[PDB]
Structure formats: C-alpha cells, structure tokens
Design a protein around this ligand. Structure first.
Ligand SMILES: NC(=O)c1ccc[n+]([C@@H]2O[C@H](COP(=O)([O-])OP(=O)(O)OC[C@H]3O[C@@H](n4cnc5c(N)ncnc54)[C@H](OP(=O)(O)O)[C@@H]3O)[C@@H](O)[C@H]2O)c1
Ligand SMILES: Cc1cn([C@H]2C[C@H](O)[C@@H](COP(=O)(O)OP(=O)(O)Oc3ccccc3)O2)c(=O)[nH]c1=O
Ligand SMILES: Cc1cn([C@H]2C[C@H](O)[C@@H](COP(=O)(O)OP(=O)(O)Oc3ccccc3)O2)c(=O)[nH]c1=O
Ligand SMILES: [Cl-]
Ligand code: NA
Length: 314
C-alpha cells in the first residue's frame, strides 16, 4: 500500500522535481495538493492527480494523507511542519528544514514524541555521485585532503541567498569533511532596496585545519560545483547539486603532469530522495543520522548568519 502523499503549496520546485517523482514512485500516491488559490491546486492536480484542496489546514485534516511534502518558502516551514506533525502526518520538508537550530530541535521533538519521520529534503544527498567521489578520495587519488570549495550561485517571505542557496554548499562541506566543522568567517551582501541577502562567502574549518570556502548567491552567473585540494592532487566536478536525471557526471582529477576525467552513471536524485523518504515511513526505520546531520547543519547556518560581516549596498 503506497504511502499517500499530500503536498502543501503549489511550488515551482514541486511541479518540476518532487511531484513528478511522487507520481512515478510505486511507493507513494499523490492524494491531495493544497494551494492558497484553489485554481492553482486544480492545475497541479490536473497534472499530477490527487484532490485539489483550498488552503493548507483542509489538507492536514484529510484521513487519506499519511505524509506531507512541504515546498513552502523557508520562513514558513516551521509553522506548517509543526501543524502537519500535530495532525499526525510524517513530513518531507524542502531544505532548509527551518531557519535556526532551536526551531529545528523543537520540530524534531514534536516528531519524536509522536513516532513520526521529519526529513529535511536535500535532493543532492541521494545522488550516488558524491559517494563515488568520496570513495576516490578515500582511495588516495589526490593524497590527504587539505581544503574544500563549493559554490552554488544563480542569476537573479523570500529566504535570501544564505537560507535558500547557501545551505547547499554548507551541507556538502558537512557531507565531505565531517561533523566537527566550525565557523571562521564570512561576508553577507544585503541589498537595501529589498532588505535581502543576495550573496555571500563563508570560511569554515575542521579542528585539524581542513578548510571549506563556500560561495553562494543570486546575483551571479550560474555555478554549481565543488573542489578538493589534496596533498598530491585536486578533484572537482560541476552540476553537483542539481544534475539532471539523465546527466552523466564527470569527475576531473589533476595531479603533477597528468589529468584524468571519469564519466559516472546518470541517476535521478529526485526519484531517489522520494524513495528514501517513502521507505523510511513504510519501514519505520527513521535514520538517526538524518536528524543529527540536519541539526548540525542548522547550527552552522546560524553560526554563519550570526558571525558574518554584513554589508549593505549600494
Ligand atoms: N528556486 C527554487 O525552486 C529554489 C531554490 C533554492 C531553494 N529552494 C527552496 O525550496 C523551497 C521553496 O522555495 P521556492 O523558491 O520554490 O518557493 P516559491 O516558488 O515561492 O513556492 C512556494 C510556494 O509556497 C506557497 N506560499 C505560501 N505563502 C506564500 C507566500 N507568502 N509567498 C509565496 N509563496 C507562498 C505558494 O504556494 P500556493 O500559492 O500554491 O499556496 C508558493 O508556490 C524553500 O525551502 C527554498 O529554500 C527553492
Ligand atoms: C542549469 C542552469 C540553471 N540555471 C538557473 C535556473 C534556476 O533559476 C536556477 C537553479 O536551477 P537548477 O540548478 O537547475 O536547480 P532546480 O531548478 O532543481 O532548483 C533548485 C535548486 C536548489 C534547491 C531547490 C531547487 O539556476 C541557469 O541560470 N543556468 C543553468 O545552466
Ligand atoms: C541520504 C541522507 C543522508 N543524510 C546524512 C546521513 C549521513 O551522515 C550522510 C551521508 O549519508 P549517505 O548518503 O547514505 O552515505 P553514503 O556513504 O552513500 O554517501 C556519502 C557520500 C559522501 C561522503 C560520505 C558519504 O548524510 C542526511 O542527513 N539526509 C539524507 O537524506
Ligand atoms: Cl564538466
Ligand atoms: Na552577522
């Protein structure tokens, strides 16, 4: 019996990534889609099936919904995940889970008391390319790791470029460098006209001095890459956070007098993340690692926001 999924918010990202994944995944059935405008819900249900619902509370009342996907703007995550969980529904929440660590702890506490899965959806984590890269690094392809860089920048209740984009390179730094990353410094550029973070750069370090330089932004040409500098080489890759489902990653390595490129298989990370969430809900095995990684993520995001030098232009 597929888990029955309801969507709250007819988000662009839902239309483009999550909802086609739900639709194709045998283990999940889209049973309800809510919007602030019934017309918008109905356009989504005409596309992906389920019952179109006006307003979010009505969807949370349905007995034919086991789990809810929340692709709302970040600042609105906490209210709605809290309500979904109190309505007894497991929750897949688009990254970032929420806005700060104390809020994320309280959301996980509400979940825990009810035996429900709360999962922060970083679709990139479900692409096998990162493990294949980490296996190459562990095999010593570029020697010891010295430093890491990652960047996600795109051309121009919104979350700002830190919450909405910066979280990606920060989460990859956690994925590769481990659980002891500490803030060192950062800059956030804030546009006065709208009062909104439009870009930033942050420096983190592990306690051994392995650094991460993370760039993010929405006033930029498109970049989406990461890079490792090693004692005997370097490794980089593009399209690291949002490779198409059919796209073959290419790992680039350079060392003294010799470079190589490896083409990896294509994978649908969006399908795989929806499958991971469904399988956990179905089995009741809610990996502890997911929640602990999300809490450490939330801490580093707060430490960046708090510690950054903030610069307002013009
Ligand atoms: N461009 C992207 O897709 C992108 C990039 C980076 C990160 N993210 C993340 O993905 C999530 C969704 O971001 P998004 O930028 O895709 O949001 P979006 O297109 O603005 O969609 C959010 C949906 O939320 C609902 N909503 C409720 N109150 C709203 C309000 N006051 N203003 C606007 N929408 C409101 C709307 O659904 P109804 O109108 O149907 O109620 C809207 O379609 C966030 O966690 C964000 O960090 C998205
Ligand atoms: C390829 C590409 C994209 N974009 C723009 C188009 C879009 O405005 C932006 C992001 O496109 P994308 O990396 O494709 O990822 P999703 O659409 O899955 O978005 C999310 C990203 C993060 C969290 C959730 C969803 O970059 C470009 O400007 N040039 C490009 O070559
Ligand atoms: C799915 C997932 C993982 N994690 C956390 C939990 C775990 O701490 C970490 C990775 O989990 P995994 O992708 O299964 O591990 P692999 O070895 O296949 O991939 C590596 C790739 C690179 C370097 C290490 C591992 O992310 C999450 O927080 N949420 C998720 O949805
Ligand atoms: Cl390339
Ligand atoms: Na600050």
């Amino acid at each position: 019996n597929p888990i029955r999924v309801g969507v709250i918010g007819c988000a662009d990202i839902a239309w483009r990534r999550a909802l086609p994944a739900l639709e194709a995944e045998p283990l999940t059935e889209v049973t309800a889609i809510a919007s602030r405008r019934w017309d918008r819900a109905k356009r989504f249900t005409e596309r992906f099936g389920g019952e179109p619902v006006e307003g979010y509370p009505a969807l949370l009342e349905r007995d034919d919904v086991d789990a809810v996907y929340v692709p709302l703007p970040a600042v609105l995550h906490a209210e709605w995940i809290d309500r979904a969980l109190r309505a007894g529904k497991h929750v897949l929440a688009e990254a970032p889970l929420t806005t700060d660590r104390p809020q994320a702890e309280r959301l996980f506490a509400v979940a825990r008391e009810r035996g429900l899965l709360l999962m922060e959806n970083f679709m990139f984590l479900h692409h096998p390319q990162h493990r294949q890269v980490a296996d190459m690094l562990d095999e010593g392809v570029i020697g010891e790791i010295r430093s890491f860089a990652a960047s996600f920048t795109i051309p121009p209740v919104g979350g700002g470029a830190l919450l909405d984009i910066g979280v990606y390179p920060i989460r990859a730094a956690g994925l590769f460098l481990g659980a002891d990353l500490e803030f060192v410094g950062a800059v956030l550029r804030h546009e006065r006209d709208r009062d909104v973070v439009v870009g930033g750069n942050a420096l983190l370090t592990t306690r051994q001095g392995v650094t991460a330089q993370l760039t993010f932004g929405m006033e930029h040409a498109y970049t989406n890459n990461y890079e490792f500098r090693g004692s005997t080489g370097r490794l980089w890759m593009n399209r690291v956070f949002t490779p198409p489902a059919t796209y073959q990653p290419v790992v680039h390595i350079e060392r003294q007098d010799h470079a190589e490129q490896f083409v990896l298989p294509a994978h649908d990370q969006f399908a795989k993340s929806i499958r991971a969430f469904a399988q956990a809900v179905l089995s009741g095995e809610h990996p502890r690692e997911w929640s602990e990684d999300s809490l450490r993520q939330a801490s580093l995001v707060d430490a960046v926001r708090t510690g950054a030098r903030d610069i307002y232009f013009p």
